[PDB]
Amino acid sequence: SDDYEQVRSAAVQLIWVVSQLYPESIRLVDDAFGKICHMVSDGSWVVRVQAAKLLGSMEQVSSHFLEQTLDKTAHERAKELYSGAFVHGLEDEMYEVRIAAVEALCMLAQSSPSFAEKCLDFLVDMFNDEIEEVRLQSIHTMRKISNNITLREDQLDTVLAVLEDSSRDIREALHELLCCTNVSTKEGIHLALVELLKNLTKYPTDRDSIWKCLKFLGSRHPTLVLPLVPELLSTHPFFDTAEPDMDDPAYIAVLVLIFNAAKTCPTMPALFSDHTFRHYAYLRDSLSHLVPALRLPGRK
Amino acid sequence: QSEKHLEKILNVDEFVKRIFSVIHSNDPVARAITLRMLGSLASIIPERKNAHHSIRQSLDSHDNVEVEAAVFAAANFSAQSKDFAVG
């Protein structure tokens, strides 16, 4: 509290650098973090950049106090329906401070294995920011913290964004996010599949990335898709299904998922229909970086 | 006969679809004719994975008059492509 600019701007750096050395005051790093928090709403906009960056760089902090930054909600209302420093920092004047905030959040989320689940909603909600840079940074941070995270109901919202005008960067970033996310519910996989199909049929230019994201989405968790095998590919029990076109880039898209999932689960070539075997041979011959070698009798 | 004139075709996907649409016909002689024709079109479609696959499929069957044509088409591609020859 020096009540003049250009002073606090570096006093914050000093408090951070001294604090990070050793946490022993009475709580020292927690106290310094609290001070930075109470400062994050500085009058200027130049200070807040350092404020955000430095607290982001910091890594060790008291858990219980950490969530008190995010504690205020319509988000918990939605969660029930299905069943403060950052709270203000995320929505600020100009996008520079938003970028700094998201970077700090990703850094300390990586640091702490917990506290991630608390921040997924705060990330996802902040997609329609209108600043493409913030868009991209939000997608990147979600990717970077995507581990041991669940989207029991967040799937639909984070996938709705997949339909952008061209936003080639945004849509590619969403595919990158999906290939590294985690889902737990079968209906979630089904939903993601259907929105991806809509994406492909509306923007027939990034199928080359749709296929890879589906490949990873299969390999990541195979068992989830096994119940879908009868339904996703038409296998009418006592009717011989007409060969679907071999080269259609929706049928190929849904086949690559199955084949990638099939490396793990041994039982499922039983579910595979008549065509799928020769079609698998054709795929494994065409796109050798999407479908791994399998145990199928046709290609021993 | 007119192989030199093949390269100067502006529209290739339509033509190849028409020619390839008769490889699924059950007739063992109609498959042999089409495999010969594909073999005669390696110059203008040397990287087509679907054609490569169909030839590699017909190469291991029970109908002599089509195996003796799949052999020809395979020898034809194996000159104008690499990823086909490796398989």
Binding site: D240, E243, D245 | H24
Partner: peptide, 14 residues
């Protein structure tokens, strides 16, 4: 219908 094209076969679109 189509005596040589087989009942279970990809249909020619055009």
């Amino acid at each position: 219908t189509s005596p040589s094209y087989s009942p279970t076969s990809p249909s020619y679109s055009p």
